[PDB]
């Protein structure tokens, strides 16, 4: 049972050198210890205005957004609106090209459709551009054989998963995930009153915010504070405490184990490994040479129900920001690291693991 001053000492010994080594302008950390949050802030949200990071600073989550997409998809499954086995064509009948014949919502959600590319092309501006992109796409692999991390995959999952609801992705996310969890400072579109809290991102001496792009909301477009992200981790560790039954079930489905690649299991947005974990696997595995590579998968049948003895995690970047979330449900132990520089994933994962290792 570590005192607050011990949590303080572990965090300052790990994060202080990380910020110095990586030249991170501003950072917020939440440590969840025995289910309670402890917050830490460093540096500036806006360097030019000398505005410090606080607990109400909004950061770009980048691909940590995909964890919200996966849970929203889980909630739609629990409502009986979709099944992951459903063909994508059920929800987008204009996808008539033959290569779409056996591609399912599961394949899109879990990057296993057969080599959908990392990014939607920058030239895709309209609905009709997006249809033409998917209609002309040629798979490198048969469905359900290879995992290739891709915004064009889970982005389309998020867009199709909400069609039965009749809601936009943004409305579905606000009404079915943000509002029931009281994430009142979490946004896809930052409102005018909240702009004063929106940190700048920093890339090679430029102050930047993420640009609009196709399927951005579903893949890299969420902004949140360290407090709402600590709540997000607590909610994903303890779904049985959530009153909204389909959202409790959706959280559980997003940590179900659908595919295995090496020592990792693919959930909906979340990625999972057995705890205790070999930190070399998660640190080296976060390097883009492994994280962006195609890797063979085996289906898990039935999908394993969410394992509480897991390292559950997700990295995320935008041009100006770098985020990481990891937690271990069985231990009620977790961490959120939000920074306004996109610094290398291995440094994030190593620091997170050193802190949670120290507190086990």
UniProtKB/TrEMBL annotation:
Alphabetically ordered keywords of this record: Antibiotic resistance, Hydrolase, Signal
Domain of life of the organism encoding this protein: Bacteria
Record domain Beta-lactamase-related: where: 12-359
Modified residues (Cysteine sulfenic acid (-SOH)): 231
Pfam families membership: Beta-lactamase
Gene Ontology molecular function: beta-lactamase activity
Catalytic EC class: hydrolase
Cellular component terms per the entry's GO annotation: outer membrane-bounded periplasmic space
EC number(s) given by UniProt: 3.5.2.6
Keyword flag Hydrolase: yes
InterPro entries: AmpC, AmpC-like, AmpC_escherichia-type, Beta-lactam-related, Beta-lactam/transpept-like, Beta-lactam_class-C_AS
Reaction catalysed by this enzyme: a beta-lactam + H2O = a substituted beta-amino acid
Gene Ontology terms: biological process: antibiotic catabolic process; response to antibiotic
NCBIfam families, per database record: bla_class_C, BlaEC, CMY2-MIR-ACT-EC
Family, as annotated: Belongs to the class-C beta-lactamase family.
Protein name as it appears in the record: Beta-lactamase
Phylogenetic placement of the source organism: Bacteria, Pseudomonadati, Pseudomonadota, Gammaproteobacteria, Enterobacterales
Gene that specifies this protein: ampC
